[PDB]
Amino acid sequence: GSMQNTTHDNVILELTVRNHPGVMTHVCGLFARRAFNVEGILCLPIQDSDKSHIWLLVNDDQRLEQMISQIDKLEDVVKVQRNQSDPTMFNKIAVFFQ
Amino acid sequence: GSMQNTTHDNVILELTVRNHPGVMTHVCGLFARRAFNVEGILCLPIQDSDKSHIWLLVNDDQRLEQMISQIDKLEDVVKVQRNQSDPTMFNKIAVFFQ
């Protein structure tokens, strides 16, 4: 929660959304109104269909998971998973493409 | 309009924003109301300060650059550049971290 230089102070919040008009605005809106902004975003375009899997690097909060539960109910979110992991994962999946 | 047999259908729109409350929502809002959504997003956290440099992979449009000119006027956007390049650049800077 207190981003000093703590690498794993962030959390890897993945959600596979399909591209409905302004679905990127949904995730950005939740973390905006939360408390603190997103550190890093990885919207990896799923080439198979009209989809993209986004990893949100954001520091954990008291409201955080309640707001994940809210954004999860949006029908653009095809999938949503909460992973307590490092921003090195962000690099790994960006370079591997999966 | 949707990379069917090309890789260069998109455009690499970089903007170095500093983390004011809900600045990620600004870029997502512009491409939402534009016509077609963002293909791929790379919000690379600038570790030096409270900033992040985002590359927006989106296909070029008639309104596109007019809307870049709009979002550029927002004071969170510290820097903005329009580059007609490939999504391989997205990978390159994600893995190199710059």
What CA–CA distance (Å, rounded) separates A81 from B17?
27
Which residues form the domain of B56? 1-98
- Quote the crossing angle between the two packed helices A88-96 and B88-96, to the nearest 10°: 150
What CA–CA distance (Å, rounded) separates B52 from B19?
7
Output the six-digit token pair for A15: 């959600």
Q: Collapse the DSSP code of B66 into the 3-class scheme (helix H, G, I; strand E, B; otherwise coil) and give the result.
A: helix
CB B36 within 8 A of CB B89: no
Q: How many domains does chain A have?
A: 1
B27: domain CATH number?
3.30.70.260
Contact (CB<8Å) A42/B91: no
Rg of chain B taking only CA atoms, in angstroms? 13
Q: Which of B28, B14, B27, B30 lies closest to B81 in space, CA to CA?
A: B14
Contact (CB<8Å) B24/A44: no
Rg of chain A taking only CA atoms, in angstroms? 13
Compute the C-alpha angle A91/B97/A51, nearest 5°.
Answer: 45
Q: How far is B84 from chain A (nearest CA, A)?
A: 18
